[PDB]
């Protein structure tokens, strides 16, 4: 029943929500590290450990 325009609309809406939620999960994770250990190790595949 979806047009390819509508499949695209759905998937993009989902991806926007995923991005917002992934950012907010990173905020939660950073807050948890800060509150607990008093420091946070930031890392990534594209971000050296500091």
């Amino acid at each position: 029943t979806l047009s390819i325009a509508q499949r695209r609309d759905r998937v993009i809406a989902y991806l926007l929500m995923k991005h917002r939620a992934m950012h907010e999960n990173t905020w939660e994770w950073m807050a948890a590290q800060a509150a607990q250990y008093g420091y946070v190790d930031v890392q990534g595949q594209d971000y050296p450990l500091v």
Binding site: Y14, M17, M22, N25
Partner: protein
């Protein structure tokens, strides 16, 4: 007596067992359908990754 002992028949002692419904309380939805099969689509979206 002699030919045969006489009797009084007292009321019959019937014992109608049953298997009363217990599990069908968690199956409240009834569908009568003539299609061959029923189909479900299950979708999981983890949104807790950093």
């Amino acid at each position: 007596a002699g030919l045969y002992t006489t009797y009084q028949l007292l009321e019959v002692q019937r014992k109608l067992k049953t298997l009363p419904a217990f599990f069908l309380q968690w199956f409240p939805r009834q569908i009568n359908f003539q299609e061959d099969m029923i189909a479900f689509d299950k979708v999981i979206q983890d949104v807790t990754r950093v």
